[PDB]
Design an enzyme around this catalytic site. Sequence first.
Site, mmCIF file in Angstrom:
data_model
loop_
_atom_site.group_PDB
_atom_site.id
_atom_site.type_symbol
_atom_site.label_atom_id
_atom_site.label_comp_id
_atom_site.label_asym_id
_atom_site.label_seq_id
_atom_site.Cartn_x
_atom_site.Cartn_y
_atom_site.Cartn_z
ATOM 1 N N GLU A 58 -6.473 -2.437 -4.819
ATOM 2 C CA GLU A 58 -5.325 -2.254 -3.681
ATOM 3 C C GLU A 58 -6.702 -0.627 -3.988
ATOM 4 O O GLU A 58 -6.463 -0.282 -2.900
ATOM 5 C CB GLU A 58 -4.305 -1.677 -4.650
ATOM 6 C CG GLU A 58 -3.017 -1.364 -3.385
ATOM 7 C CD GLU A 58 -1.947 -0.892 -3.754
ATOM 8 O OE1 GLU A 58 -1.107 -0.286 -3.204
ATOM 9 O OE2 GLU A 58 -2.487 -0.607 -4.970
ATOM 10 N N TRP A 80 0.450 -5.175 1.063
ATOM 11 C CA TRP A 80 0.529 -4.539 2.251
ATOM 12 C C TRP A 80 1.756 -4.432 3.320
ATOM 13 O O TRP A 80 1.538 -4.567 4.508
ATOM 14 C CB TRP A 80 0.072 -3.484 2.556
ATOM 15 C CG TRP A 80 -0.406 -2.007 1.314
ATOM 16 C CD1 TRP A 80 -1.055 -2.092 0.668
ATOM 17 C CD2 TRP A 80 0.662 -1.109 1.790
ATOM 18 N NE1 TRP A 80 -0.409 -1.548 -0.767
ATOM 19 C CE2 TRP A 80 0.628 0.152 0.268
ATOM 20 C CE3 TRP A 80 1.768 -0.877 2.234
ATOM 21 C CZ2 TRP A 80 1.109 0.565 0.201
ATOM 22 C CZ3 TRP A 80 2.485 0.594 2.265
ATOM 23 C CH2 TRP A 80 2.135 1.283 1.236
ATOM 24 N N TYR A 94 -2.471 6.797 2.349
ATOM 25 C CA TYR A 94 -3.392 6.916 0.895
ATOM 26 C C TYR A 94 -4.776 6.838 1.194
ATOM 27 O O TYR A 94 -5.038 7.961 1.176
ATOM 28 C CB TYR A 94 -3.499 6.353 -0.674
ATOM 29 C CG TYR A 94 -1.347 5.768 -0.417
ATOM 30 C CD1 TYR A 94 -0.746 6.954 -1.551
ATOM 31 C CD2 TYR A 94 -1.160 4.890 -0.202
ATOM 32 C CE1 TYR A 94 0.778 7.286 -1.605
ATOM 33 C CE2 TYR A 94 -0.320 4.192 -0.638
ATOM 34 C CZ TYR A 94 1.143 5.547 -1.442
ATOM 35 O OH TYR A 94 2.836 5.095 -1.683
ATOM 36 N N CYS A 146 4.852 7.388 -1.758
ATOM 37 C CA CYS A 146 5.538 7.098 -2.881
ATOM 38 C C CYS A 146 4.782 7.998 -4.078
ATOM 39 O O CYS A 146 5.297 9.001 -4.502
ATOM 40 C CB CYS A 146 5.349 5.152 -3.249
ATOM 41 S SG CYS A 146 6.377 4.876 -2.253
ATOM 42 N N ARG A 166 7.440 10.787 -5.589
ATOM 43 C CA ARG A 166 8.222 11.127 -5.093
ATOM 44 C C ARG A 166 9.432 10.124 -5.042
ATOM 45 O O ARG A 166 10.795 9.948 -5.416
ATOM 46 C CB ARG A 166 8.586 11.635 -4.110
ATOM 47 C CG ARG A 166 7.317 10.563 -3.406
ATOM 48 C CD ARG A 166 7.962 10.490 -2.159
ATOM 49 N NE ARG A 166 7.855 9.312 -1.067
ATOM 50 C CZ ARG A 166 8.898 8.370 -0.516
ATOM 51 N NH1 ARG A 166 9.895 8.154 -0.395
ATOM 52 N NH2 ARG A 166 8.010 7.160 -0.250
ATOM 53 N N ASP A 169 10.422 2.351 -6.802
ATOM 54 C CA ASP A 169 10.940 0.959 -6.988
ATOM 55 C C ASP A 169 10.400 0.442 -8.817
ATOM 56 O O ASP A 169 9.463 0.165 -9.095
ATOM 57 C CB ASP A 169 10.272 0.240 -5.876
ATOM 58 C CG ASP A 169 10.874 -1.206 -6.526
ATOM 59 O OD1 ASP A 169 10.956 -2.489 -7.211
ATOM 60 O OD2 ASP A 169 10.621 -1.632 -5.245
HETATM 61 C C1 LIG Z 1 3.223 0.219 -6.017
HETATM 62 C C2 LIG Z 1 2.488 -1.079 -5.422
HETATM 63 C C3 LIG Z 1 1.712 -1.513 -4.302
HETATM 64 N N1 LIG Z 1 2.310 -2.092 -3.465
HETATM 65 C C4 LIG Z 1 3.191 -1.269 -2.145
HETATM 66 C C5 LIG Z 1 4.085 -1.273 -1.673
HETATM 67 C C6 LIG Z 1 4.227 -0.741 -0.514
HETATM 68 C C7 LIG Z 1 6.356 -1.338 -0.244
HETATM 69 C C8 LIG Z 1 7.082 -1.095 -0.946
HETATM 70 N N2 LIG Z 1 7.905 -0.802 -0.707
HETATM 71 C C9 LIG Z 1 9.231 -1.608 -1.589
HETATM 72 N N3 LIG Z 1 10.025 -1.244 -1.333
HETATM 73 N N4 LIG Z 1 9.085 -0.871 -3.310
HETATM 74 C C10 LIG Z 1 7.608 -1.379 -3.544
HETATM 75 O O1 LIG Z 1 7.678 -1.364 -4.971
HETATM 76 C C11 LIG Z 1 7.194 -1.177 -2.569
HETATM 77 C C12 LIG Z 1 4.809 -1.576 -2.940
HETATM 78 C C13 LIG Z 1 3.013 -3.159 -3.294
HETATM 79 C C14 LIG Z 1 4.295 -4.401 -2.764
HETATM 80 C C15 LIG Z 1 4.780 -5.211 -3.018
HETATM 81 C C16 LIG Z 1 4.539 -6.044 -4.567
HETATM 82 C C17 LIG Z 1 5.115 -7.196 -5.230
HETATM 83 O O2 LIG Z 1 6.037 -7.473 -4.091
HETATM 84 N N5 LIG Z 1 4.864 -7.285 -6.129
HETATM 85 C C18 LIG Z 1 5.277 -9.281 -6.333
HETATM 86 C C19 LIG Z 1 4.572 -9.875 -5.789
HETATM 87 C C20 LIG Z 1 2.904 -9.944 -6.077
HETATM 88 C C21 LIG Z 1 2.562 -10.883 -5.307
HETATM 89 O O3 LIG Z 1 1.745 -10.752 -4.563
HETATM 90 O O4 LIG Z 1 1.695 -11.095 -6.222
HETATM 91 C C22 LIG Z 1 5.241 -9.502 -7.717
HETATM 92 O O5 LIG Z 1 6.086 -9.903 -8.478
HETATM 93 O O6 LIG Z 1 4.463 -8.143 -8.576
HETATM 94 C C23 LIG Z 1 3.894 -4.474 -5.422
HETATM 95 C C24 LIG Z 1 2.997 -3.735 -5.400
HETATM 96 C C1 LIG Z 2 6.368 2.984 -2.216
HETATM 97 C C2 LIG Z 2 5.242 2.284 -2.894
HETATM 98 C C3 LIG Z 2 4.366 2.172 -4.425
HETATM 99 O O1 LIG Z 2 3.196 2.839 -3.980
HETATM 100 N N1 LIG Z 2 5.228 2.978 -5.079
HETATM 101 C C4 LIG Z 2 6.310 2.474 -4.808
HETATM 102 O O2 LIG Z 2 7.452 2.829 -6.178
HETATM 103 N N2 LIG Z 2 7.253 2.930 -3.589
HETATM 104 C C5 LIG Z 2 8.189 2.520 -3.179
HETATM 105 C C6 LIG Z 2 9.592 3.831 -3.442
HETATM 106 C C7 LIG Z 2 10.709 2.743 -2.550
HETATM 107 O O3 LIG Z 2 11.216 2.168 -3.085
HETATM 108 C C8 LIG Z 2 9.770 2.421 -1.377
HETATM 109 C C9 LIG Z 2 9.665 3.206 -0.070
HETATM 110 O O4 LIG Z 2 10.460 3.434 0.902
HETATM 111 P P1 LIG Z 2 10.801 5.150 0.429
HETATM 112 O O5 LIG Z 2 9.773 5.363 1.559
HETATM 113 O O6 LIG Z 2 11.306 6.080 -0.703
HETATM 114 O O7 LIG Z 2 11.680 5.387 2.017
HETATM 115 O O8 LIG Z 2 8.635 1.382 -2.030
#
Ligand SMILES: C#CCN(Cc1ccc2[nH]c(N)nc(=O)c2c1)c1ccc(C(=O)N[C@@H](CCC(=O)O)C(=O)O)cc1
Ligand SMILES: *[C@H]1CC(=O)NC(=O)N1[C@H]1C[C@H](O)[C@@H](COP(=O)(O)O)O1
Lengths: 264, 264
Positions: A58, A80, A94, A146, A166, A169
């Site tokens: 990433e 993603w 980004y 984020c 900002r 999760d």
């Molecule tokens: C931050 C960031 C990058 N991202 C981008 C991203 C995009 C949208 C999001 N949306 C939400 N609600 N939370 C996030 O943290 C989030 C993160 C991530 C997205 C998913 C996972 C996740 O599902 N991780 C699992 C599975 C990993 C795998 O594929 O093996 C895990 O168990 O960790 C991690 C990072």
């Molecule tokens: C967004 C992607 C990232 O790199 N880190 C996060 O923690 N991200 C989380 C934060 C929220 O749970 C969600 C984005 O939703 P909002 O735009 O805040 O409604 O992904």
Amino acid sequence: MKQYLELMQKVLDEGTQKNDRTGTGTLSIFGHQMRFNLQDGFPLVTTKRCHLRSIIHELLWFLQGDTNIAYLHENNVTIWDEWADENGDLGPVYGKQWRAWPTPDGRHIDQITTVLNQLKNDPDSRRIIVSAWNVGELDKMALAPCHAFFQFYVADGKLSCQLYQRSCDVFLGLPFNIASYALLVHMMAQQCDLEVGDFVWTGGDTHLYSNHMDQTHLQLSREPRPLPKLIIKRKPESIFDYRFEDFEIEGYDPHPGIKAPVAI
Amino acid sequence: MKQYLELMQKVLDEGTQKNDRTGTGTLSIFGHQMRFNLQDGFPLVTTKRCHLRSIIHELLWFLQGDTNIAYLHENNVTIWDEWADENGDLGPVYGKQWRAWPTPDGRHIDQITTVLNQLKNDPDSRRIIVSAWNVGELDKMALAPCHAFFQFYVADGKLSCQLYQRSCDVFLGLPFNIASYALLVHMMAQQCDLEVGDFVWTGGDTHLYSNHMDQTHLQLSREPRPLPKLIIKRKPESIFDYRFEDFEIEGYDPHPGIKAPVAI
Ligand SMILES: C#CCN(Cc1ccc2[nH]c(N)nc(=O)c2c1)c1ccc(C(=O)N[C@@H](CCC(=O)O)C(=O)O)cc1
Ligand SMILES: *[C@H]1CC(=O)NC(=O)N1[C@H]1C[C@H](O)[C@@H](COP(=O)(O)O)O1
Ligand SMILES: C#CCN(Cc1ccc2[nH]c(N)nc(=O)c2c1)c1ccc(C(=O)N[C@@H](CCC(=O)O)C(=O)O)cc1
Ligand SMILES: *[C@H]1CC(=O)NC(=O)N1[C@H]1C[C@H](O)[C@@H](COP(=O)(O)O)O1
Ligand code: NA
């Protein structure tokens, strides 16, 4: 990690319930700050197994300026998928803002190159900033940034970085965000002949999803293991020329993975 | 204030020497956070008298979208004189970005109007942001934005705000920045029928200029006094319709003002 588990416990102890965009519901605090001295070790969460290969790919993808998931799929990275359109596009998220922020008069600013030149030529500048928060392009992005705004600093021969995140999760995203920026600091420091300082993490809406609570408490029952160690095997000619194989993580001995669903 | 004096002492004790843009020299730390519960009182520094007329008019000027100092001069406020050009212009600094951020395609976003509508229609949003850090216009600004990026948050009927301040003159600037954002929270809460929550202040390069040491020792010798109370005497039709006379700060009993020259 100690700082990470303390944040989880703070959200639990001090958060309040909020509805959210995804319809899932969260427990939320506003405002937090913590630090990772990168000379202590590489800050990859050990109280569950984390998918480091996805973190590296990433970051390389961001640094290329890419915003389509094809490169991620070529490398079996699916993080993603849920937000991309039918052609794999996320819009000007980004990577695009980092490498090519569009200006009002038709220019594009490569903020990563800008930072590198500032660190080399004027490290006491207070303006060594990258922003992903391009107000005029938010409506084209699949999700709003984020990890939104970050700043570099140099003292005593060491490179530090502070991120303003900002929205966070805590269970799924934050382990990735911490490791990603730590890796970026190492890469930037290598290109500038600096040692590594601190990664300072600052949060806005810092939340645990309502369907991550059993996972969170399972993780909180576990003792952190020693931090692993990051080894970089080559100094490329620029920050944009790293490859996956240039990095190795030594001594990573995590507790078992803990599965949880992402909120779309 | 207790947290303000703790920060001042920390910069003295732990800051490292920097050769900054102005050539003056500073002691500097990187990464700090403070929290002011606005229901505890209005966070106006009491260990020196702060010039409320300048703080209020500067904020009203930002909210007008104005970047020329004529309005400030009409109200006997001189805090921006040293950076304005011969016509009184500062370029596209805070007020312009807050009210008329230019998109790449010739449109504008009024970030303040957007935030008011987010607070009223989507108070749970994690995207309630104002950025002054318009990368594509930095080269036209007389100084780069110090108070760069801020976020609002609503929980249990209370409005909070966090500022990311990438560069902070602890002595001259910070008392103004804290009071300004606290006043903005009160004004937005009034317009949205919310109670006031916290102002969270986060700093990047947080410094004391090398010609402010006598003034710093003087202020650190003084004990803080109880915080005053903000009274809004009239509820205007919108966030854009406030006037200086609408505000009264009650019970403000500061130590004497301290004279210190600004670094240009
Ligand atoms: C931050 C960031 C990058 N991202 C981008 C991203 C995009 C949208 C999001 N949306 C939400 N609600 N939370 C996030 O943290 C989030 C993160 C991530 C997205 C998913 C996972 C996740 O599902 N991780 C699992 C599975 C990993 C795998 O594929 O093996 C895990 O168990 O960790 C991690 C990072
Ligand atoms: C967004 C992607 C990232 O790199 N880190 C996060 O923690 N991200 C989380 C934060 C929220 O749970 C969600 C984005 O939703 P909002 O735009 O805040 O409604 O992904
Ligand atoms: C933040 C901000 C806004 N600003 C804008 C602004 C612009 C450039 C800066 N440059 C530097 N080096 N430090 C600052 O804090 C700073 C602040 C301010 C500028 C000056 C003062 C100041 O000189 N205050 C004195 C005198 C006030 C008066 O009576 O006129 C004081 O005693 O407080 C305060 C705020
Ligand atoms: C800038 C204006 C403000 O609102 N607050 C501040 O504290 N400001 C200070 C920070 C620096 O001392 C100086 C700006 O100089 P740089 O752009 O950081 O070199 O003003
Ligand atoms: Na994968």
